[PDB]
Amino acid sequence: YQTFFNPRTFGSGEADCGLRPLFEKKSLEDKTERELLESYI
Amino acid sequence: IVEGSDAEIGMSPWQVMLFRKSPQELLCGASLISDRWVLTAAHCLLYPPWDKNFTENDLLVRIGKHSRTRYERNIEKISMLEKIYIHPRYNWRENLDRNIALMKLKKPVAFSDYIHPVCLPDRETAASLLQAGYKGRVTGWGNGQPSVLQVVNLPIVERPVCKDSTRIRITDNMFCAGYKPDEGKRGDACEGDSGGPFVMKSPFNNRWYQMGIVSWGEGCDRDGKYGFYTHVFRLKKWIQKVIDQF
Numbered sequence A: 001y002q003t004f005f006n007p008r009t010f011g012s013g014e015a016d017c018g019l020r021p022l023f024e025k026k027s028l029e030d031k032t033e034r035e036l037l038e039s040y041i
Numbered sequence B: 001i002v003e004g005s006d007a008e009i010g011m012s013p014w015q016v017m018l019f020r021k022s023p024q025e026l027l028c029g030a031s032l033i034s035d036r037w038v039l040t041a042a043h044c045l046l047y048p049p050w051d052k053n054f055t056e057n058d059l060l061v062r063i064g065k066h067s068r069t070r071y072e073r074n075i076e077k078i079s080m081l082e083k084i085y086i087h088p089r090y091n092w093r094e095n096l097d098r099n100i101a102l103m104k105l106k107k108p109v110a111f112s113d114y115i116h117p118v119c120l121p122d123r124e125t126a127a128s129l130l131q132a133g134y135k136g137r138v139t140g141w142g143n144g145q146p147s148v149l150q151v152v153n154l155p156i157v158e159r160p161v162c163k164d165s166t167r168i169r170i171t172d173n174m175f176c177a178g179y180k181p182d183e184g185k186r187g188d189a190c191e192g193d194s195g196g197p198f199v200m201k202s203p204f205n206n207r208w209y210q211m212g213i214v215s216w217g218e219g220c221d222r223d224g225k226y227g228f229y230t231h232v233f234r235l236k237k238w239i240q241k242v243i244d245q246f
């Protein structure tokens, strides 16, 4: 229980959040994510 | 979604679709934030002017879908809802301030290559990424309508421009995003995308964060206006209070 939400009530998932099994986890990029990252000046 | 492109399989694994049980109809988008909690817009569940006031047993959600019309065997999952919680200060008669709701799944969903939660922003992420010009992403089906999930990337708008684009009284709990009415581009979220997530990818840790919740829309035309989004980071402590008790 070092996460912001208590897993007892939140359930599982917080620690590995936001890393997509088919993209980030495989070092693969989607077709338009560059457009987002390039906008972050 | 209007003027978007085909999303790729597994590209938005936190996307959740909310349906009316009977008669069966797609109502709104939503997002998976854990194996048992889903975030959406309050107006997807409660909007008295249209006689909308759903209870847990009136709805269901489908998770892990890509095709709107094809049933994806052993991929998509369906879940009933145990409880719905709408923000007590949600202002439906005026400006839709605090337009946010949480839904607890009757049973946790199993994560897979197609189902995975999105992150909620921490302070540094919100301060760093929620800036005019920076783009976020919205996903949903096309609307004749669509075959597969569509995606659009939209830039956050300066607050003075948002404020002058509408007669409603905006609050700091919402932000607006979209391209200028000219046509530098003009993809956008639509009515059917209400409740879905507006996500941004942190260049710092490679993770996707849900910065907003698609607010009100009617059709796919805003008559020169910008779509609004509920500011998730500002409502983070409310989300925690509901979950830590629910």
Ligand SMILES: *[C@@H]1O[C@H](CO)[C@@H](O)[C@H](O)[C@H]1NC(C)=O
Pocket: B046, B047, B048, B052, B053, B054, B055
């Ligand atoms: C029923 O709908 C009314 C009118 O929209 C709303 O004020 C009330 O909170 C709803 N009832 C419950 C307990 O969900």
